[PDB]
């Protein structure tokens, strides 16, 4: 047989039922970088269909930089 | 006969590929294979035990790390950078005007090897190589010389600073492999050209340093100097700029021979244009005079390049024969090209 799957090995997934810390209402600075995070994260997460409809392919690759702060 | 059906069983069927670490006079040789496996193997078979030497491939029979024989296997990248071949089509007769320039170095490469009688009977023997140089961007113009030397004997070309200071050295050890492998294939010739080791500035990747490039050039000298290698491997050196080259090179070698590359004269320029246009069909109105007079200090591949673009636009008109008008405007692309840059 093989892994069920997926029974690992390591990591693991979750730890996010005891987390996260506080909501996004904390920081109010960005409002733009958070909108690129918005459209690049949870707009594709809710809709895989509207992209194929409009005919633009959403990437999964996300890279952040600029620290500090 | 029976020995072939005997030793195979002992060494058969599987056997590990081992590496000889060092030799003990017992006939037991300390060996090494992945990983950290030392041992004593006394065998009298297939050996050749003298010529093995440490750092070489010895067979290892699984019972137990026994050596039934040795296999020398290369390959190696540097053996691949030597040939092949070209046995190039370009004779020194395909270039002109340097007959006096060449005739000496032509001797010094063919004075030994081919036609040794005068050379060996004379008891003189200067087979230390040569040195070349010439402006402004020639030197492969002197690979039109060495391209005739590529038509005889044995040869390897290693040129450019890039192959020296590339990554963190290890200094000359690439130059060491070159020298020793060209000694293994001796007789041979090693052609160096455009030594920018001091002329280049930036260290490739993360590397240092200027003095370690100077000390790897230094060991290039000592390995060429040298203590103590009579092997030949003759050395031909060339460059654009003789200024940055240090005199530490010249007294060991090449002390006797170095040539200067002049720029061509009227009859040499005309000669070269005739050489390149020998193949190409040209229109009846093509004239070389206005060409060699209008141009200033052009070598072979310059006017050869104007032949190349003349045939390029001749193919834009799909004519097998180049017209002098399209030769003067197509020329004007290189004329303006050197006037634009």
């Amino acid at each position: 047989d093989v892994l069920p799957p997926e029974a690992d090995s390591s990591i693991m997934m979750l730890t996010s039922d005891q987390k996260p810390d506080v909501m996004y209402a904390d920081i109010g600075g960005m409002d733009i970088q958070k909108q690129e995070v918005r459209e690049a994260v949870e707009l594709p997460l809710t809709h895989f269909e509207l992209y194929k409809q409009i005919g633009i392919d959403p990437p999964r690759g996300v890279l952040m930089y600029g620290p500090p702060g | 006969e029976e020995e072939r059906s005997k030793v195979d069983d002992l060494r058969g069927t599987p056997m590990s590929v081992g590496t000889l670490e060092e030799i003990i006079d017992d006939n037991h040789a300390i060996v090494s294979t992945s990983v950290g496996s030392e041992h004593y193997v006394s065998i009298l078979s297939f050996v050749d035990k003298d010529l093995l030497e440490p750092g070489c491939s010895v067979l290892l029979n699984h019972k137990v790390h026994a050596v039934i024989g040795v296999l020398m296997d290369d390959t190696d990248p540097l053996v691949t950078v030597m040939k092949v071949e070209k046995a190039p089509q370009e004779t020194y007769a395909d270039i002109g005007g340097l007959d006096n320039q060449i005739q000496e170095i032509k001797e010094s490469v063919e004075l030994p090897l081919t036609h040794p009688e005068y050379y060996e009977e004379m008891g003189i023997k200067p087979p230390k190589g040569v040195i070349l140089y010439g402006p402004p961007g020639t030197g492969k113009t002197l690979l039109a010389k060495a391209v005739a030397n590529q038509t005889s004997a044995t040869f390897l070309r290693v040129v450019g600073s890039e192959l020296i200071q590339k990554y963190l050295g290890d200094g000359p050890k690439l130059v060491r492999e070159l020298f020793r492998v060209a000694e293994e294939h001796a007789p041979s010739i090693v052609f160096i050209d455009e030594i920018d080791a001091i002329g280049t500035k930036r260290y490739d990747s993360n590397s240092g340093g200027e003095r370690e490039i100077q000390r790897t050039m230094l060991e290039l000298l000592n390995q060429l100097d040298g203590f103590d290698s009579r092997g030949d491997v003759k050395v031909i050196m060339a460059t654009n700029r003789i200024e940055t080259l240090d005199p530490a090179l010249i007294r060991p070698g090449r002390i006797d021979r170095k040539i200067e590359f002049p720029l061509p004269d009227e009859k040499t320029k005309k000669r070269i244009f005739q050489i390149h246009t020998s193949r190409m069909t040209l229109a009846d109105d093509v004239t070389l005079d206005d060409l060699i007079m209008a141009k200033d200090d052009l070598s072979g591949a310059d006017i050869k390049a104007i032949c190349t673009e003349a045939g390029l636009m001749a193919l834009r008109e799909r004519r097998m024969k180049v017209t002098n008008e399209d030769f003067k405007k197509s020329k004007e692309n290189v004329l303006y090209k050197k006037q634009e840059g």
């Binding site: - | 070209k86 450019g160 840059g341």
Partner: protein, 343 residues
Amino acid sequence: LNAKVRLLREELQLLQEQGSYVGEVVRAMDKKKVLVKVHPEGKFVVDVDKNIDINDVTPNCRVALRNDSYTLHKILPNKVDPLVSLMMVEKVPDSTYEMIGGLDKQIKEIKEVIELPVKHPELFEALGIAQPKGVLLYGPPGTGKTLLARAVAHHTDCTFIRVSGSELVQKFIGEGARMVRELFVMAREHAPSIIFMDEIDSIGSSRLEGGSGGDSEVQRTMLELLNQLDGFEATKNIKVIMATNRIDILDSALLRPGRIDRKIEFPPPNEEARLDILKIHSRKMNLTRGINLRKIAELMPGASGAEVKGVCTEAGMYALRERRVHVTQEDFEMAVAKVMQKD
């Protein structure tokens, strides 16, 4: 069927103590033995194998390694180039001549340089003329200098290679050396072949000190490569392509004393180029025809080629957030504003 369940028992017994290995032949030997290198283990050398033949076994091949005699059970497919064309396959798409526009003059002027030595070359000597060693592309980025490379090599079918390449092409190819002779060994294995210079065109790298030698040893890479091609080796069709802007146009042509290269310009974007290539990028997104492409391309003075991509895609963004399945002109103009904000 009753015999197969018994077969699994006996077969289990032969694979139980040692199963069977997976070998890799580094070289074959004259005594019918074959030098085999296992990944976790050291190198071996092992013999016939009456079912296997020596002429069927060439060095650098994955071979099922028998466990008992340590011999080869099967021949299996290996992968050599897929790291070459992998490192390159992530770099650049295929990009046929339908993906490019405005370069018709320049693809027409490169088609002789690349397409002559591939199909015609006997007419080189019919004209008596030498073969082009390479080509360069100089122009403000801009895009298309990279697309045209794998466009010409895509329609020529000759294998496409971009130069270093990091980091890991020094891994797969060779060990340590000048290394352009080992890359040139791959280019000899697969011929005809295209070598592109990727990319080292930068303002980074505009200091004329670090980029001087740091690039000038890729310029020296192609240089001594041109010593290889020009002076010796064999035969043709292995060619080099440049992508630069300025400086090292003057420093390379300072190292190219009229010799040797084919000069081909790379243009800045034009308004009609923005028209038709703007339609080329706009064909892939559900949209409305109400857009005027004249004024929406004239809204982009200067800019670049990938500017068209950012305009069309980043317009599609307001279309997807707007919930419209098809877009409108006003949105493509909003994306014109977006890409002109950084200007």
